[PDB]
Design a protein around this ligand. Structure first.
Ligand code: GDP
Ligand code: GDP
Ligand code: GDP
Ligand code: GDP
Lengths: 416, 416, 413, 413
């Protein structure tokens, strides 16, 4: 849900960077291409993708990381910052200042407008506002009842009249009525049409002149991908007070293309629709959105990994109970150590452990599993095969025998 | 590479459990079905999958977790333990005791036998052994040269004669020759055939009687999935000293079906092949393998998550520099706190923060982004909308103003 | 959309059988394995899959094709009839005979029940019947206006009272009322429940008060094989029970749900197919299974012809290039392989020999036959293992067809 | 296997054009968008994709189809010729004219060079030529025995010395020797390099000593669009350069590599296709692009016919069910829709009206036409908006076909 695949793909290019052995020009070129592929696949206009990834390439190649910041962390920064501007740079909230603050909603059939009208009403009501909705949708009068269905539970008033045929008349009667009732916010649901043709924009100019809304909000179906550009653009040109809600971002392969498309337009995206239910709407705040997108600041994720690790306890416990009965092997030790040195942030020491591994990599399975069998000629083979001395080998073995004695002789009443 | 998809799918059922709200019978039934799907998809025989998931279901449903172990952690344990037995229970290494320890390799064309012969020779040489290989493959005499190609770099002797036509003669001349040269280990590469027919098993019984190997090793192509069963079984019945290497597990959708199939047979799997290169072989140790498979003990993973998190530093840094100039918002605070309480393992307190969130969820975007605008009537709306008091609301705001004053007045010389 | 990939997976096992070189026992084991994989992935209960897939294996291993039928064609027939029986075997339509034929609809929240009430009203209305729906759904009010929303444009009476709190009362009142206005069919939408529990099935009350001709449980198909226990409990609790399975569109587990329900014997009357009023189709197992496996696809065959003709311009440019005397052995080799499928001129054995010869020519030779020396013809006959006579034969046939094209005129359609 | 999904993605855009209701400008924008997506996903350089995909858009928006060609067929022709030029335009085979025609093979480690040396020797040998390969690969010895391994069963002379440490010396010695034994073609395998750097291209040395007829760089196709810089650097450094791209089988980025190389103009002579000695095919852009897009698929059309006939048993059981007088309106409706595609009896407008009527019948009515009352016929004509006369018409046609079947005998094949 919500750009979804695009998220994973973008985050992975950033992980790759974090994990990269070093930052050369080849790393960048791959990053840029990883991003082009992810973007294009989410239906982002090709020209837009080129422009963005050429800026990212450029900034990475020729920009010195500020003091105490690696080339690597600065790349992560460049990508985050470029993507954020690519989706509108910053939040542009809806201001509620005027008394009845009037929001006029426009959109074609199947944009998800009716539903979005309910979502927006509920968003505001949840936050202590009195809301009235006015249904002036004469194009599919079933909308009055659909709004009743979505909104009655919340006692949010829905003014309508499935038996009125003048669209502008309807919108004015409604606004005046709900305005009489004392509301803070009025949301006006206008008639859809099949496409966003001249008729539709003309009808919005007319309804807007008559009711004088605080804001006109075009609802765009985000599954149309980059085709949202021209729809947003025509709208943004027919109204000095326009904003956009983009719906159906959940699961859609193409929502990325819609957001980037609308943002290329200048028009402000204020909310996104996120599913079919009344609460499935979230305000759009580019830097925060792009941050969830890229998997940044994932402290929750880190905690899940810890928790998951801890639930492995009965397994670890039985491992240890095996050690207590002396069933402890060179493989078990190999691992104990391996974990110890991968724990920063009976201790061997980094170099000595690095040597210890090298020695065991020259042992056979049967030796790792039954050290007891490791006689002297074996030791001289192990030493020869690992490029170390028979001394080192007997050292490692001593360490093993030491740790083995420990476990074999343990309280049988503890917890590691 | 290596069961790959099956790994991710199995690990996810275990993650689901770790994350589950509670452990009821419905959770189990879903786990079992998640595992059937993963298994069947990797070509594990259906009857085998039924038997395994019925045991897992049973143990989960009717088994009490030992003292101090949750139902949840005990399920994780049951799954790990069942899967481990399903793939052979424990390591059965190859013992090198006899002087020339002789390993006789059998397999059909395209099993990856020739390559596996080199991998096994190199595995042993790397570990300080003198190795000789004897190529008695009269069925595709190009094999002598292929072995030379793989093995010359290591100075591992390859006895052969692309111009000898008696297979058993060849294998005996070779063994005697390489035996004269002083080797610890001799690997004998017999002639393949098209399928594993009676001819092939008969020819192995004959060659085995003549050379008297320490072990006979059948090389099975793991991309055949569950069809490995009958091949392993026929072999295991034609020799009291048989083991198995399963090749091409890397990337293959069906290797899971091969391992489970061979293990159902009783025959010991000693190594797996892992790719085309000479080092692409690993010993098979069921509990360790099933442990990597299920993503258990992933301390490395945890460390990667930390490292990745740290590379986000230039971003966090610029966030903070915004706070220093007083550009700090209710959203920024909302987050600071949210992270603080998700950090165990200026502090508010769990209940107070839970209340704080509830209040902000009743604020609008413009309020969260510009607290300054929050006059008194707004506060009474916020308080009403959050089901709290105007006192609580002014409390939260005070906390905000406090934290805001802090940042606005900071050294501009530190690091958070 | 509906059972999408399950369909393709099954359809492919049949193509593989049609395409099979010969029908040994290993072709049956691969078919049986391929089917188990497709079914398990659609969330079919694994025990069911064994049961179905074993019978298919047996029937195919130990059954002699009737007279004039190959082993291949009988395997196809086996797979098709087993899947048909697997999914219910035969259609069991709703019977409208009584005046107010009354349908009681039950379901848990989110199963798609309320939408389904509407789709079904529309189904009948569209066919000439007068329909009225009684909304006795007191559990999630909003259901009443949802039915208004969906149904008003069809002037289908919707009786309800979003203020009535008694479910039995509302149902009784509504049925009586709608029955007054002389409707042929009454569909009653009952109150949902969070889950299908003793509370839900305890529908018996309403059913005992309104005496429905039929009681339809609406099941969300995305639950997959979990539909089994749900349909079973419901079928146990009523002698007059039928099922509608919804949300089959795009569903990964729809397969599992249909087979789950059918393994219960409760009849599947319709399937839901989308969110819109028309996304409902009556269920008819053999028709369904035939579309599923892509059987009798004349439409498919036609499309392929259409598409092949659309290539006309390209074909015509190739030919214009021949009239200009640019016509290679490559082009010829293709024209022949082509002609050996113009059915349903040179022959089938002479063509077979011509191939073999060209397969010993190099790329420059195939592309510039003009350059073919005398020694080259020796190299070729030698490499192809044929007589230089064979080689010069082919080269003549070439020279023929060539000049033939060179001396056509642009009146070539 | 080779360019797998790229092929399907492109082939589908053409099916969509063939299937298009009408050809407006939005059908071109979707085609152009669909192509950009397929190409970008195959790792084609994005700037190339713009360039190609813009030209395709223009040529289609502002070009009038020649006489007798529809807009549709011209779009198909456009897509096909652009992709062809995109991938090299026309075949450029290796020319064997000189006695020892000498081929110098270069490549970096893992590009598949040594295998490719062998596949190519085999390619020629198989066609009658005497071939000898000189292994001057001092960088990864093992290459010599690899060539022995691959080549001995063909008695293709392999000259080498895994002990010789001088690359130029070994090449010179080997060429001279092999040339003595009277080989038509000599293939020289040069030492690889970790990467294609000044060191690698500084091949000029060997080329100046043995004077090859041609120098072939072997490129690993899985590097995708990174092939461009590699082919460019190499082509700059030699007037006689050709490319072989390997590892195209299963490759996700093979597309990107072919277009990368072709945008350089260096001729692509062969492609590698697998690990085996026979997995090499000469590259011929128009042939390649035609297979890619699935053009001229007669084989495809045949397969579909074959598969449809294999359904005979099922068809025959359906019919046996008719002879028993079990033949519904469902069956009839199907027999008719069917017959309206028996081309290429009732008519096309009478059938159109029959549909409409049945579409107002319920499932019990379609399945038990016997039950169709007098009032039912009113309900139906009313719901279908036709005359009860129309309804009884259809019902007659039914009754006809029915008894007709009922009175066939089991001599029905
Ligand atoms: N998945 C999803 N569906 C949505 C969203 N918004 C609206 N829809 C659905 O889109 C369809 C049409 O929207 P609706 O408001 O009902 O009608 P409209 O006013 O004509 O566009 C309905 O099926 C809605 O459930 C969304 O954000 N996500
Ligand atoms: N990917 C992969 N390929 C393998 C493995 N083992 C062998 N192969 C390949 O399988 C093919 C045939 O195996 P090979 O040893 O060369 O011939 P054989 O003795 O006839 O089976 C070669 O292409 C090998 O590279 C493996 O573990 N992984
Ligand atoms: N895709 C799909 N969605 C459906 C189908 N039937 C119902 N739905 C959706 O399921 C959701 C819940 O169904 P609804 O009738 O509204 O509510 P219910 O009575 O509580 O189940 C609604 O969004 C419907 O649009 C179907 O057949 N296919
Ligand atoms: N799939 C595939 N693999 C190939 C192809 N050509 C070569 N290879 C493999 O690439 C690997 C390296 O090629 P090779 O000729 O052995 O070594 P090189 O000379 O160092 O490139 C070998 O495993 C080959 O089997 C090809 O066309 N397709």
């Amino acid at each position: 849900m919500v750009l979804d695949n695009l998220g994973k793909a973008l985050a992975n290019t950033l992980k790759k960077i974090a994990r990269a052995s070093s930052v050369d020009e080849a790393l960048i070129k791959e990053l840029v291409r990883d991003i082009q592929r992810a973007l294009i696949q989410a239906d982002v206009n090709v020209r837009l993708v080129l422009q963005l990834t050429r800026e990212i390439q450029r900034r990475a190649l020729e920009e010195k990381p500020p003091a105490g910041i690696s080339k690597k962390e600065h790349i992560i920064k460049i990508v985050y910052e470029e993507l954020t501007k690519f989706l509108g740079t910053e939040a542009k909230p809806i201001e509620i200042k005027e008394k009845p603050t009037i929001l006029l909603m426009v959109g074609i059939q199947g944009s998800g407008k009716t539903t979005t009208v309910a979502k927006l009403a509920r968003y505001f009501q949840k936050r202590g506002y009195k809301v009235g909705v006015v249904c002036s949708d004469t194009w599919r009068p079933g909308a009055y009842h659909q709004l009743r269905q979505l909104l009655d539970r919340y006692h949010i008033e829905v003014f309508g009249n499935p038996q009125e045929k003048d669209a502008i008349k309807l919108a004015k009667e409604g606004v005046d009525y709900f305005k009489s009732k004392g509301v803070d916010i009025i949301i006006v649901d206008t008639a859809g049409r099949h496409k966003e043709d001249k008729a539709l924009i003309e009808e919005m100019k007319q309804i807007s002149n008559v009711i004088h809304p605080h804001e006109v909000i075009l609802v765009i179906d985000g599954t149309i991908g980059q085709q949202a550009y021209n729809q947003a653009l025509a709208f943004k040109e027919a109204t000095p007070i326009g904003s956009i809600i983009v719906t159906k971002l959940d699961g859609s392969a193409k929502g990325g293309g819609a957001l980037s498309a609308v943002a290329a337009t200048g028009a402000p995206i204020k909310f996104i629709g996120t599913g079919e239910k009344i609460d499935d709407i979230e305000p759009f705040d580019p830097p925060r959105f792009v941050s969830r997108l890229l998997g940044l600041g994932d402290i929750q994720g880190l905690l899940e990994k810890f928790k998951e690790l801890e639930k492995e306890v009965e397994i670890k416990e039985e491992d240890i109970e095996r050690f207590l009965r002396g069933k402890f092997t060179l493989k078990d030790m190999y691992a104990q150590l391996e974990a110890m040195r991968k724990m920063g942030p009976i201790s061997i020491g980094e170099e000595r452990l690095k040597k210890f591994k090298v020695i065991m990599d020259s042992m056979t399975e049967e030796e790792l599993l039954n050290p007891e069998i490791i006689n002297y000629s074996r030791i001289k083979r192990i030493a020869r095969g690992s490029g170390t001395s028979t001394k080192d080998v007997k050292e490692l073995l001593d360490q093993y025998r030491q740790m083995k004695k420990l476990f074999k002789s343990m309280n049988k009443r503890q917890l590691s």
